[PDB]
Amino acid sequence: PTVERSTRMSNPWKAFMEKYDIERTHSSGVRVDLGEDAEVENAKYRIPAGRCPVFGKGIVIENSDVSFLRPVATGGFAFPNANDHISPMTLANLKERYKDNVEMMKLNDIALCRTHAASFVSNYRHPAVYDEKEKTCHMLYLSAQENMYCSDAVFCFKPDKDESFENLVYLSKNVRNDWDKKCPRKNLGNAKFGLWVDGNCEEIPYVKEVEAEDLRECNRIVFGASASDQPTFKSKGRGFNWANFDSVKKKCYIFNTKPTCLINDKNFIATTALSHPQEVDLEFPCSIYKDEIEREIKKQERIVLPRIFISNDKESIKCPCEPERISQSTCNFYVCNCVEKRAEIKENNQVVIKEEFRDYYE
């Protein structure tokens, strides 16, 4: 009856974190999304391409008071004239129009808005804004998101997040219908993003630190700093997309490397450029570590314990020494600091196998 440590280098956050891999899941600009090309007759144009909704984004028109959701002066960015019969359209009106379509009736409200907007005729399809407070779908006739120096005689505008846009959802024609499982929306309370380094979630060493008065402002800053397809290129979703908000220090730490786990810390909220400006879920998944450890022990003599060195059950880790209690932790997590680490974080926030172990891991 032996117990031993696994050599297998896992990560129990794998499934939980896929949605935060913005490069892989969204794959286009966030602050400005112009990720695809489309031609109308002969004429190459750029259009929004991201696969995730961007919560709380809108377009500010400089030195103007017209909302971008106003129909274009046949004004804002929205579809004009029509009869009001294609845009704007209420959820009720959308549900009316598409009532005998079994598949369109299965879509959630955002996806139904997106699908409607994207159906109108090239692979040139129009982006939409769904106002979740008014339950109203707006098709955007103008796909430009920024014209900013601004060198009144010039039409200046930029994307932004602020309170008047907080219920808005900016939708490209590519947005996934299952965005709710695959994309960011809510902010993660009692958590900061981190990097998984052989059995514990570690701080991201290279970040940009910024003053922020509240979550809204931190989510606005990261939005501002986020992947952008705007000419000076296709970002492909690469960018400073993620931020940790220190609720107590009133600081925003932004970074450009995708996170691979969460650190349970009562002082922080984890937000992203896509995420809602305000919604916060305070319930950390405390049981993530104990679950994998227990699941593995139910593999089978030889007990082989995972390389998981943090848990809410201090004995399950089988620490060589006394596990440290993490005081910042709402989960009352314990960490085993006194173990053999096979990975370390190096420049540009890259997690690498330590030298002494490289040959073994191939």
Kindly write down the DSSP assignment for every residue of 179-225, as one continuous string: HHHHS--SEEEEEEEEEE-SSSEE--SS-EEEE-SSHHHHHHHHHHH
- For residues 298 and 197, state if they share a domain: no
Find the CATH number of the domain harbouring 270.
Answer: 3.50.4.10
Q: Which of 134, 169, 185 is the last residue of a domain?
A: 185
Q: What six digits make up the tokens of 49? A: 């391409």
CB 12, CB 310: distance < 8 Å: no
Cβ atoms of residues 190 and 330 within 8 Å: yes
CA distances from 251 to 166, 219, 247, 352 (A): 21, 11, 7, 29
Residue 211, beta-bridge partner list:
251
> Among 345, 342, 340, 341, which residue's Cα sits nearest to residue 361?
342
Of 147, 163, 185, which one is at a domain's C-terminal end?
A: 185
d(C-alpha 237, C-alpha 233), whole Å: 11
Contact partners, residue 332, CB within 8 Å, separation at least 6: 312, 325, 326
Say if residue 326 is in the same domain as residue 339: yes
Q: Report which secondary-structure segment, H or E, holds 117.
A: helix 109-118
Please name the residues in contact with 170: beta carbons below 8 A apart, sequence gap of 6 or more.
53, 54, 57, 58, 127, 129
Q: Which of 245, 239, 241 is nearest to 192 (CA)?
A: 245
Domain boundary among 185, 215, 242: 185
Per DSSP bridges, beta strands 136-139 and 89-90 are: antiparallel
Residue 322: domain span: 1-10+286-362
State whether 72 and 179 are in the same domain. Answer: yes
> Is there a single domain that holds both residue 60 and residue 170?
yes
Contact between 356 and 212 under an 8 Å Cβ cutoff? The reply is no
- Using DSSP's 3-state secondary structure scheme, residue 292 falls into helix
CA distance 124 to 238: 24
- 109 phi, psi to nearest 5 deg: -60, -35
Under DSSP, is residue 247 helix (H, G, I), strand (E, B) or coil? coil
CB 209 within 8 A of CB 251: yes
Note the resolution in Å, 1 decimal. 1.8
96 vs 31: CA distance, rounded Å? 33
Are 40 and 136 within one domain? yes
**Residue type for position 308:** I
Number of domains within the chain: 3
What are the structure tokens assigned to 112, written together?
Answer: 């139904």
Experimental method: X-ray
65 shares a domain with 3: no
Q: Are residues 269 and 135 in the same domain?
A: no
Rounded Cα distance between 335 and 327, Å, is 11
Same domain for 250 and 359, yes or no, is no
**Which residue has 């227990």 as its token pair?**
294
**Which backbone phi and psi does 230 adopt, to 5 degrees?**
-70, 135
Same domain, 63 and 152: yes
Give the HSE-up count for residue 90: Cα atoms under 13 Å, Cβ half-sphere: 5
